[PDB]
Amino acid sequence: TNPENYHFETLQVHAGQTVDETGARAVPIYQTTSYVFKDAKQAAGRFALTDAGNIYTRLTNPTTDVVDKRVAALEHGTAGVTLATGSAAITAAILNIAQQGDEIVAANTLYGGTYDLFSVTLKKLGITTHFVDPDEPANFETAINDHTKALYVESIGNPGINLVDFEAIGKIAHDHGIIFIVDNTFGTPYLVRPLEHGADVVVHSATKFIGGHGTTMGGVIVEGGQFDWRASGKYPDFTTPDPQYNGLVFADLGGAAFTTKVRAETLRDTGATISPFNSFLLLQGLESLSLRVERHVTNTRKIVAFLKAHPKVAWINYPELEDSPYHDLATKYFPNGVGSIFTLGLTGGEAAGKALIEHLQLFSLLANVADAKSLIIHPASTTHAQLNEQELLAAGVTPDLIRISVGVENADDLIADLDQALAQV
Amino acid sequence: TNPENYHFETLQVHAGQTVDETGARAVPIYQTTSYVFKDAKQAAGRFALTDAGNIYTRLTNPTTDVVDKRVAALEHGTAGVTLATGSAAITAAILNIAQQGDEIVAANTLYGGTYDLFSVTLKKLGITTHFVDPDEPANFETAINDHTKALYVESIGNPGINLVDFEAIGKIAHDHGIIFIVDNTFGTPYLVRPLEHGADVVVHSATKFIGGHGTTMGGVIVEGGQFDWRASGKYPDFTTPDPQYNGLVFADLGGAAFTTKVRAETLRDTGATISPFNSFLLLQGLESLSLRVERHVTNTRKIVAFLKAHPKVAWINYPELEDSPYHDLATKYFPNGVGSIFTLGLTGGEAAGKALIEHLQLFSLLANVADAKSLIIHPASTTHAQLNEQELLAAGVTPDLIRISVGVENADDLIADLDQALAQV
Amino acid sequence: TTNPENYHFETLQVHAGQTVDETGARAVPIYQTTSYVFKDAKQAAGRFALTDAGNIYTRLTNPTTDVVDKRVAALEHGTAGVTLATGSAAITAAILNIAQQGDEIVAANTLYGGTYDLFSVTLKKLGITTHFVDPDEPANFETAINDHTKALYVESIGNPGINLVDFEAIGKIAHDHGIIFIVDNTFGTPYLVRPLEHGADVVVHSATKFIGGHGTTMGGVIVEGGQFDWRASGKYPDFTTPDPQYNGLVFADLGGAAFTTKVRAETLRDTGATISPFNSFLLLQGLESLSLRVERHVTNTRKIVAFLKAHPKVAWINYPELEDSPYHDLATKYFPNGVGSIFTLGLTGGEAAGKALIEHLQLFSLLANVADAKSLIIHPASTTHAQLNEQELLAAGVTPDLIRISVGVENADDLIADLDQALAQV
Amino acid sequence: TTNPENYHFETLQVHAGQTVDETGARAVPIYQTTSYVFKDAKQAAGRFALTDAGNIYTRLTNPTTDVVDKRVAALEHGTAGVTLATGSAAITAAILNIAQQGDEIVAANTLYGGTYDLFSVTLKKLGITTHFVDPDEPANFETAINDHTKALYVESIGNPGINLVDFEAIGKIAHDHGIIFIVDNTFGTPYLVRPLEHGADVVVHSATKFIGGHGTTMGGVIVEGGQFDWRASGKYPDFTTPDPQYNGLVFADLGGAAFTTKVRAETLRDTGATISPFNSFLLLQGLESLSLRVERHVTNTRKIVAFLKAHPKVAWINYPELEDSPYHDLATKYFPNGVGSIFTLGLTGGEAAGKALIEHLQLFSLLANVADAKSLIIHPASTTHAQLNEQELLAAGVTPDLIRISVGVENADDLIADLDQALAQV
Ligand code: PRO
Numbered sequence A, B: 001t002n003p004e005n006y007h008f009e010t011l012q013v014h015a016g017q018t019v020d021e022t023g024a025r026a027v028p029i030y031q032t033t034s035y036v037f038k039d040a041k042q043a044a045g046r047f048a049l050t051d052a053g054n055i056y057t058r059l060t061n062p063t064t065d066v067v068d069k070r071v072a073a074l075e076h077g078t079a080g081v082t083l084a085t086g087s088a089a090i091t092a093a094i095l096n097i098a099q100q101g102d103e104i105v106a107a108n109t110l111y112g113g114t115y116d117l118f119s120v121t122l123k124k125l126g127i128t129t130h131f132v133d134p135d136e137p138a139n140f141e142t143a144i145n146d147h148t149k150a151l152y153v154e155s156i157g158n159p160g161i162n163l164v165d166f167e168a169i170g171k172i173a174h175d176h177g178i179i180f181i182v183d184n185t186f187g188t189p190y191l192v193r194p195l196e197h198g199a200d201v202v203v204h205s206a207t208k209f210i211g212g213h214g215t216t217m218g219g220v221i222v223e224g225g226q227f228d229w230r231a232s233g234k235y236p237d238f239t240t241p242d243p244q245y246n247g248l249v250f251a252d253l254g255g256a257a258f259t260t261k262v263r264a265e266t267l268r269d270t271g272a273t274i275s276p277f278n279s280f281l282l283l284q285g286l287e288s289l290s291l292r293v294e295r296h297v298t299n300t301r302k303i304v305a306f307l308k309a310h311p312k313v314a315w316i317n318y319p320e321l322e323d324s325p326y327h328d329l330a331t332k333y334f335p336n337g338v339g340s341i342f343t344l345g346l347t348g349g350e351a352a353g354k355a356l357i358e359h360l361q362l363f364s365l366l367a368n369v370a371d372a373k374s375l376i377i378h379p380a381s382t383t384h385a386q387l388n389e390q391e392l393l394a395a396g397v398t399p400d401l402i403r404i405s406v407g408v409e410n411a412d413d414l415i416a417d418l419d420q421a422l423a424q425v
Numbered sequence C, D: 001t002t003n004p005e006n007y008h009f010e011t012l013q014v015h016a017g018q019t020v021d022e023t024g025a026r027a028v029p030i031y032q033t034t035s036y037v038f039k040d041a042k043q044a045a046g047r048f049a050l051t052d053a054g055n056i057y058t059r060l061t062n063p064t065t066d067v068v069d070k071r072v073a074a075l076e077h078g079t080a081g082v083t084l085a086t087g088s089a090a091i092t093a094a095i096l097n098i099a100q101q102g103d104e105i106v107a108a109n110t111l112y113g114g115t116y117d118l119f120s121v122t123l124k125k126l127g128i129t130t131h132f133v134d135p136d137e138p139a140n141f142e143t144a145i146n147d148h149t150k151a152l153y154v155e156s157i158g159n160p161g162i163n164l165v166d167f168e169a170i171g172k173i174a175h176d177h178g179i180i181f182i183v184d185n186t187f188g189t190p191y192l193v194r195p196l197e198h199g200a201d202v203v204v205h206s207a208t209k210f211i212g213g214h215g216t217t218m219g220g221v222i223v224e225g226g227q228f229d230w231r232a233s234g235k236y237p238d239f240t241t242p243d244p245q246y247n248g249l250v251f252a253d254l255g256g257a258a259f260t261t262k263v264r265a266e267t268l269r270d271t272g273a274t275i276s277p278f279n280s281f282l283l284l285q286g287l288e289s290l291s292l293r294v295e296r297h298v299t300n301t302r303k304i305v306a307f308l309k310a311h312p313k314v315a316w317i318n319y320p321e322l323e324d325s326p327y328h329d330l331a332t333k334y335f336p337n338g339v340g341s342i343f344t345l346g347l348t349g350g351e352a353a354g355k356a357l358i359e360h361l362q363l364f365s366l367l368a369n370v371a372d373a374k375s376l377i378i379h380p381a382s383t384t385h386a387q388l389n390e391q392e393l394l395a396a397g398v399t400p401d402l403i404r405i406s407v408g409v410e411n412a413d414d415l416i417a418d419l420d421q422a423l424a425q426v
């Protein structure tokens, strides 16, 4: 994990970065695809996974490697692996422990994407996921069984902005001998470390917060390295020596089991590999993640207060709020804030929200979150237009719903902009 | 397709590139993740796929778009889509027309990767692929049936360096109402256009030739737009309106059917999206593809002749050679050459090849092909060490086999380097 | 003009100069191009004539770099900006823009090693003499001014030496003699002090350091305040006398864009110290967090300066904000948000003690840079200022026992802990 | 020294200066960094002292850019190279490296618009006078030489004007007077003519054009032949007299790296026209195909020049290789592989005919650049050389009816077809 016990701010700046022979203080962009092997042994050794080193950029990259380590350090885990996007980090994570005919138990509150994947695409492939209501931790136990291999939820609903009892669902899963995978995109390691509250694997859509400016895509998978793969016995690929990899037992890697299996199977075969550039820009984003998340909260705090007190605001979801049905969860798991993404409904309903959008100057109309620039959009008509009233209202998406992602601009300017706009709907 | 009927050299330089309002002569790197929508309608419109424009970089990118068009133009197809890597362009291509419990008929001669994917990973997902011997076009018909939805082969075996009767297998597939997907990595549009000899879809690993210098990864999928999806009837997802996409019938797009379905399903859900940088470097590579491939052939020609005449060379595979079991295929389908990748066996067997490797100065020991720098490696101990003697000798990988990828250096220097080295094994 | 709807720093550093093209792309595209297609022969001819606004040649204009120009100027509260390859190039251009052969410049003794040697050796060879004055006494500049003097140069915070200067004072003394006031605001950044609003006419920057923020990309920026009469003073003819090469165009006629437009059209076009659109993109990213980053570098440096002052093995510690530094008054008047994150320090054991301290710290990297997100430490006299020797070395506050530290954005405690252990091993 | 195991152009452009780091990465890493961690206080001090080889500061040294230096020099068959931000910056540095105030340069009249105005306006202001001679008669240079003259400058192929020059001739005339011969080989590239091997001492390049090859990235390269006695001639003191700032180091003591090492240590460090490691990476990619690309640009231009000569509506066509151009002899002697892909042409209808032709072609883009993979066309007098007017305009072969064309690597037939249709519409 973290060697000389460094604090978050130090880890987000140094984690997994070494200095090569050139003395280059910044991580070089290893925009290469292959690596020269010392001799014919090392070649066979690297491809056999028995000799530590670079192999192929689809599999390995000195730049991307620093991201794996660094994110893991922040997430306080044991090993990380990066991928083309968040969607791919999810697809890989799932496929690593779910075969055909098997199933997984995932929360009702999910990003339009994560959802339409679990339900339409990966099922089509014979892996259906049973959607439970995250508000009642026990609600998962009811759909669990023998074909179930992992309990999946999002650290903060998208757009349900609903918290969940991490520790509860973690045991409910371990009691049945399966792992807890938490999609921490919305919370980030600075706000919450699912791996330290009952989670085994944490996925991220670095595209959003880790990246920081809406310029780069990428996903990350971090493992806690705290789940006996043999014990539970429910994960064969992990137990049964791999013929294709020289009878290697993934469970023998320990803290690196889950991640070295994605890299050697899913990643190598499906190839949703990140480009060294993207990884570079992620390293820059991480070098300031905390600082930006800190402002993302204090800004959202101020913007939420002003919005709650405005007559023209019907309702406002935001766990930290003293009267949100999740306030208690917030205080227990999110001591530093609940993010900067929130939903709200206006008093003039649907036509009013879109109207507000059409008047704001500092809020951009687009599909994204966690940009340094503030954003707003109406989920139902976009990011979740892949779900019918059936799932739509099941994930909290109502015709009057409007979503906001608070940037790092000046709170006064954002409030002023919001004011002038509402003063016209 | 190609509007004012331009020749290959003109298309590889201009295809799908327009000039924006800035006047920028070079395609800008759109290192962005989202796009600002005009109003709430356009947002809903883009996400509904009813309004042409950018949506999300996982789905769309102005830079990557030029690659889609450009490659397609060269491949002489109707529509292209790019992806994170070649492996992902393959995974996506397959998943676009193969559900669970279904199967596909693919050649025995395949890249270590393409293979271990079709066989271990995608089966695990309940899609097994029956490996036929490409030498006998009829050999495919025997394993075809009702669950079969596509016939897949590589334009040039890796490392079988075996040609195949494109037109033969194309009909053998259309007679049974399925499509022909040809992995043209090794041949490229300048040497062969599978789409014009019985192929419906062509996949590429731009990582290799299109890229040109071993710096960038990426895959491409191009469709010929010449297969009635309704007629054959064997492709439901293409016939049955998509609920998630507003009851859209993929077959209604025509020339853009196959590609807009990968982008809207597999890509959007699995997210093996290319980074705008990678796409940029591909555009540069394409702007010179032909010129480099031209030298790749004339260089390999000269290097093959010298190698055939050297006493210490046991055997040498290279279709163009007057006595290779494929010479006739070569003359019919490859009028401009058969590439620059070839295999050879030495007279001192295994230990001799690796020895040759350990002596060469201008040939680099690594896992890659089509680099401007020349490369050599022993497949059995690396790129195909995922197959047992069973598949290993089934794809032409023998203990004395050595593979070479001819660069663009000076033929005399390469021959000289090879000479001095052989003069020591 | 300037900042339209009167926005605050945090909003400008994130939005300033950034429009949405037809592609609708939210992030600024990286325009890695060298040329631009012109509408017919006239648009082409009119652009090259500088009469038609638009792109011409990346050596002169770039859509990506353009956002940098606007944004940086916006933050620095100026009217126009032009960016260049490095901080050194921005400085070289600023001078050369208003300095011919036979002219002279009066500059502070406290200057970064490069800047010094540029004024003293490189520009000397071309008939541009520079008088190095002691910035502590504003009147000292008056003494060296004369007919050939054409500009007064100072740094917002000496490098090294950490000495502040009376902006308004030197500002007046310069305008009273009809010359411009050039401030190299590198160490301060627009967020700590805006020299253009306290008597300065042109402010240059080394985006390499703070603006970029991670030690990964290089570039310089020149920003003009556009509130200095070029005609009036009369000492800047090129700004008044029509430019033959440019259809008799008179640069002073451009108003708020006179100085920078002269650089782009003269010095920049001809010498070509051009930034690459890539770098510009990375700078934009940096600017998008400038305020947040500069904020921590300071809170961090404050604590670390405290600890280091109380520590027995510390001979002395320069940091203007310290209640008794000979510049404290200048700090309160001009630097309400802090005095940055770069300070010098002397050790009890002299030089050998310092070099010992460097080699033992684990969170401070020994390299030549400042403003990195990572913390840095180095010994100025043997590196950054080794082209000067002792007389000029000592004219800028560089003593053999001097050690320089650049506080990063890591955890303040860890940094102190690291500092402790190293000092004990000294 | 130079090219070790005697390799050919195609092998050098792909391998020259590229090593494999510990990561084993085959492709040259992009070192997007500004500084480098130094081993203890001495390595640091020794690097800054220029006595310890290694990286110092990206403004001075970069592992990515370094491959560019070696490689380009290798191809140009020289001993040492240094790269800079642009072609203009490489030229500016080359001159300033051997030119002080009060010195003069004698250069060809045929110069790219920028180069001209740099010599004539920008460098004039700094006491560096340049005498513009007629390159057609080598003796013409002798006439302007004198005590203050310190270098003879010419382009391998005038821009525009497409005029060749007697390399060896001007080379001797310059060494007979103890001065260097500087050639701007942009238009030719090391693959068509290697000025360093035919009487030249320093050859500069605008990688922006051919080396890069796609109009996407900018940069300049300076290459020295290292076969000119600095001590002997005696006219280059700075090369002989110990450098105080550098521990009395004498630049001439460096041998084959004297000229370029002076640029990196003086002009470059102080003015900072530094390339970005990104650009360098893109240049390396370009170099990896230079020979192949230059080969087609020529076969293509040959055909296109033929067609255009026979065409009725073509008043005249400049291309040295043409059997009757006043430079054909120079072409056969010096350019055995072709004379490039940039030619000028006059139309029967004069200026208006030309500008008409431009606006009608579909495969030729109207922009300011050459050597793109895409074909280009432009009218020099209203753009690239509009800072010069008629007297100096006409001293470089730029006539109001002149049209310039840069042949790309598209299909030769399509280009001709496109040209036909446009001419008919004229
Ligand atoms: O500091 C930051 O937030 C940005 C992220 C990419 C480059 N620097």
Ligand code: PRO
Residues within 6 Å of the ligand: B211, B212, B213, B281, B284, B285, B288, D213, D214, D282, D285, D286, D288, D289
């Ligand atoms: O011409 C070429 O081959 C290279 C490819 C990337 C940049 N230019």
